[PDB]
Each structure stands twice: as structure tokens, then as C-alpha cells.
Design a binder for this molecule. Structure first.
Ligand SMILES: O=C(Nc1cncc2ccccc12)[C@@H]1CN(S(=O)(=O)C2CC2)Cc2ccc(Cl)cc21
Ligand SMILES: [Cl-]
Lengths: 305, 302
């Protein structure tokens, strides 16, 4: 019993974290085989971050300008290239701790673990979700740039996120490992704002099934609804539309608990229109949307890595 | 900016997790140097669980009865001893991945990270607090016994908890790494119940200072309170008494924000009376009590 916000064990990623220094800027890099990946804004100064021509800034740098530190060892940079918003530093030594890995781009509503780092040293691990507005509600301070997001499937680490910046509202923006930003963001000091956020409906439903599996049933009702009727209700409360794919994905949880997806939707509609009324669900007075249907199955069955 | 429930990176602990099998029971063990630590109930035949005589059960065992597996390698048990509710299995190989470590016993209110494991394999990491009633609100299934709680300071891992059992309310009970249980629990399937749980007041106050540091001030008021008037009100909401030690501990956060501890105590009293009125504090509609004053300073400064 119990339901916690759980992250993947971070060990496979810890053995990849390095510190990257260029001029006055120090941030984190990810050392896989003989390449160190880090945000390209590590080459920016004070005037540069205003209007940066990264090709112009990069051509002026030599390999010895990038100081890379893996623990108490300095790695020697033998080449450099840029791929979108990520800098790739070729090093002379292949990381002996390199795990089996893939670079994957995730969709909004998917979750991942973040290994927050400062000066190439891991300090914490937390679980979070890519918001529908493409931001992440992370916990980051200055120097955390280059910290990575990942999932672990069996023994393979899927790297999906690299931290680049904080938006004025305190939320965070970054890229996949190929340097493509999630969201309409750019890596420079300029007026940027996160769009209006919405609730990840499929995730709230998965979390309601997790509550049922854990003995919480007060919110259940005899009623059912249609996808059209539920999507009208959901649009009024800034909830993401629920698709037939979402219903199909929730099928195993519907079979285990005996509550049809549209039956749980009628429970969710009643909760949106009437509130919790002093009650909680899994120790929360708000509807939680940072557990996917897969996270619920994985945790309520104990899958290991 | 941002405030997340953050766990310590688990790598140093992952390299210590092993599987321990004795008869029909399989659970997790912690391999440090040449010793594997695990719950002593791994020797129980479920027919013993009501009133086990662990000394009587252990004397009948030999080293070769304990099968220890570290990954796809079987370790050889060369000795065994019991220290309180923990079994210590001496093995013929020292763990090369053994980090710098200490065994620490924590007090209620203290937080720690849990590396949940099944069959010696880590499956997840989460952040926990030792409840005032000595239980932990964990996320554990059968086979998770032997999973450990820890903190990391600098490069040293402080092991503070080992999981032993789930109580009838779904909460969890366990020991420190010397085998001493937290709370009035026994490693027996006898009728046992957690005492009434209370809110960790010092932790809620630390979390209110974390909200002020991140820009949330809506809950502050022009009032102050005496410590005794605060406790008289707090007790009525099942909040733990706030001691002068708690007030002293909150001093650095009071100095950083410019809000006296007893002024923040008056804010908590008003929140307990009014509720949140549709608002949230650090993305939560409930008062959070699983961040200590030390956690707040660490996550908001380094
Ligand atoms: O509590 C225990 N295990 C667990 C531990 N954590 C979370 C669980 C979730 C769900 C099922 C078990 C869980 C064990 C085993 N169980 S039991 O499963 O009820 C038994 C029929 C095998 C009795 C028991 C009694 C005393 C002691 Cl010390 C340990 C234990
Ligand atoms: Cl303590």
C-alpha cells in the first residue's frame, strides 16, 4: 500500500554527470561514450545572451577553452560541434560508466525523472511531467543548467530532457538531447512567457484508479457519461481533451478495478463541478496530474531496474 | 525557483542492494563491506510469524541455508549473527561499490529518501518523513522488506531506516540499521496499530518560510503569538507541540525572510482557522509537513 511520487533510480545517470566551464560560466554536461552534451548557452557572456549568434560565438572558441571535469579528473576536449541548442564536446576518454541509452523526445503529459546537478555533482532526484504548455514545474537554482530528465526501461536509460532556463513565473524550459526545445522558447535573455497551462486529464484519471486500488472509493458514483459530454465539461475547467487513445490506454486499469473509463469520467466531472468537500484522495486536496497510466501500473505492481 | 519533494540521488545505495533468500522467503539486503544486513524475519516460516523465537530459529540455521545474490552473482555466506531485529550475514566478498557510510538513528519529523527494491533490484526512489507516531507513509508491496531509508551529506550515506512490515492502515514500520524498531512495534504478526498521527509543526513552519522565499506572502498577518498560546491552538488541530528547540532551529529562516518565528506561528494559527479559501501555497492545497528546516535551506540555497 501507499502511493508516492516516485522517480527512477538515478545511479545510471549519476555516472554520466560532468562539470563544463567556458569563460565565466559553469554548468552541467552529460558524458556518454566520448561526447559531453551541454546547453550551447555555456559559450555566452553578458552582451552575448541579449542577441546571440551561436555560430559566430562557437567559431571563436578552441577545444582548450572548454574545461570539462568528471569528478576530480579533467577530461581533454578534442573537438566541438553544435546540434540545435546543444553543444557536443568530443573528449579523448570514453565514459566507462556509460549505460545502455537512447535519446527520445517526449510528448506533453508524459513524466520523467530529473537529476538536479550543480558543478557536475548530483544533488537531488525528483519526478515531474512535461506540462501541456511545454514547461516543467521543476526545482532549479542558478548552475542547474545541463541537468537531465530521463526514464528507465529495463536496463536502458532514455534521455528526454536537458535543462536550459527558468521563465519569469518560476517554471522551467529546456530541450530534448538533440537540442530541440520543448515549447515556443528560445535560449536567450528576452521577453518570454509560458502559455496558459491545462490539466493532464488522462493522468488525473490514472491517479483516480490508483486511489481506487489503494482503497479510496468515496468519489465513485453509479453514473457514466459520453466522450463528447465529458470533453465539453473538461474544456470549461482548463483540462486537456480526452481522446479515444487515452481511453484505450486506461483499459487495463478499468479491467483491474471494474470501473469503465467513462464511469471514472463521470466521477471526475462531479469532482470538477462540486469539489472534494473537505475530503482528500491519496492524501491530496487537489486532483493530481503528474502520474501517467503507465506510472500507476508500474508502482501498483513493483517493476524493477 | 520551484519547490519539489526531492529525494537524494540513489546510485550510492543501488550498488549495495542484494537479494536474500532463506527457504521460501526472499527479501532485500544491504551489502556494505563484507556484511549483508537484512530483516531477521527472513528466517520465519509464516507459521512462526505470530510468536517467533528468533534465537531458536537462527541456531538451527547454517551459512549455506542463506542464499545471497548480488546481480547475477551468488555470494558465499561465511557467518551469521543477529543484532536486535536485523540479521547480519558475513560474506566472503567485500562490496567494491561500498560508499563512505554511517548508521544513524533519526527522530520523528526527520526526512529521508527510500530506495524501494524487489528481489534485490531497485525500482524507485521517493522522499519520506518519520511520522510522530513512528510510522512512515511509504509505497511498498510484498517483497519490499529490507528496502532502506537514507540521507546523503557531501559523499557520505547515512543509513537511517530498514523496512520490515506494513501495518493494517497501510502505513509502514521498520528499524534503524542496528535493528532497533522505530516506535512500539515488533516483528510479529500480532495485533499492532499505529497511534493517532499528528502534523509535524516545525516542518509546516519551515515549508511556510520556503513559500515566503519563493514569493508567496498571501497567508502572512499582522499578528504574533506567545509559544504557549500557539501550542494551545495547534493541539486542537492534531499538530505536534512546538518546542523552544524548534523555535531556535527556525532562526536562520526567520533571519533570511525577516519574519519572526512567533509571527509565522500566528500565520499558521490563522491558516488552521480559515483554511486556504481556494488558494494554494507552493502548489499545494494542504499544509505540507515532510520538509524539515534543513531541507528548506538546502533546496532554497544549496
Ligand atoms: O508486512 C509484510 N510485508 C510487506 C511489507 N511492506 C508492504 C507490504 C504490502 C503488502 C503486503 C505485504 C507487505 C510481511 C509479510 N506479511 S504478509 O504479506 O501479510 C504475510 C502473508 C505473507 C506479514 C508480516 C508480518 C510481520 C512482518 Cl515483520 C513482516 C510481514
Ligand atoms: Cl534526526
Amino acid at each position: 500500500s501507499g502511493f508516492r511520487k516516485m522517480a527512477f533510480p538515478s545511479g545510471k545517470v549519476e555516472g554520466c554527470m560532468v562539470q563544463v566551464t567556458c569563460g565565466t560560466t559553469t554548468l552541467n554536461g552529460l558524458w556518454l561514450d566520448d561526447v559531453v552534451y551541454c546547453p550551447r548557452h555555456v559559450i555566452c557572456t553578458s552582451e552575448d545572451m541579449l542577441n546571440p549568434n551561436y555560430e559566430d560565438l562557437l567559431i571563436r572558441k578552441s577545444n582548450h577553452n572548454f574545461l570539462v571535469q568528471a569528478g576530480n579528473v579533467q577530461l581533454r576536449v578534442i573537438g566541438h560541434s553544435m546540434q540545435n541548442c546543444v553543444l557536443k564536446l568530443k573528449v579523448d576518454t570514453a565514459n566507462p560508466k556509460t549505460p545502455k541509452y537512447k535519446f527520445v523526445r517526449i510528448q506533453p503529459g508524459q513524466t520523467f525523472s530529473v537529476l538536479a546537478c550543480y558543478n557536475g555533482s548530483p544533488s537531488g532526484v525528483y519526478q515531474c511531467a512535461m506540462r501541456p504548455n511545454f514547461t516543467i514545474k521543476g526545482s532549479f537554482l542558478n548552475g542547474s543548467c545541463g541537468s537531465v530528465g530521463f526514464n528507465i526501461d529495463y536496463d536502458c536509460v532514455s534521455f528526454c530532457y536537458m535543462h536550459h532556463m527558468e521563465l519569469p513565473t518560476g517554471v522551467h524550459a529546456g530541450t530534448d538531447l538533440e537540442g530541440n526545445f520543448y515549447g515556443p522558447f528560445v535560449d536567450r535573455q528576452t521577453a518570454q512567457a509560458a502559455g496558459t497551462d491545462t490539466t493532464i486529464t488522462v493522468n488525473v484519471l490514472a491517479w483516480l484508479y490508483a486511489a481506487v486500488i489503494n482503497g479510496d472509493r468515496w468519489f465513485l458514483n453509479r453514473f457514466t457519461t459520453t466522450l463528447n459530454d465529458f470533453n465539453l465539461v473538461a474544456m470549461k475547467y482548463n483540462y486537456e481533451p480526452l481522446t479515444q487513445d487515452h481511453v484505450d490506454i486506461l483499459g487495463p486499469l478499468s479491467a483491474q478495478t471494474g470501473i469503465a473509463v467513462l464511469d471514472m469520467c463521470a466521477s471526475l466531472k462531479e469532482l470538477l463541478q462540486n469539489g472534494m468537500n473537505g475530503r482528500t484522495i491519496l492524501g491530496s486536496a487537489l486532483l493530481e496530474d503528474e502520474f501517467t497510466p503507465f506510472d500507476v501500473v508500474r508502482q501498483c505492481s513493483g517493476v524493477t531496474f
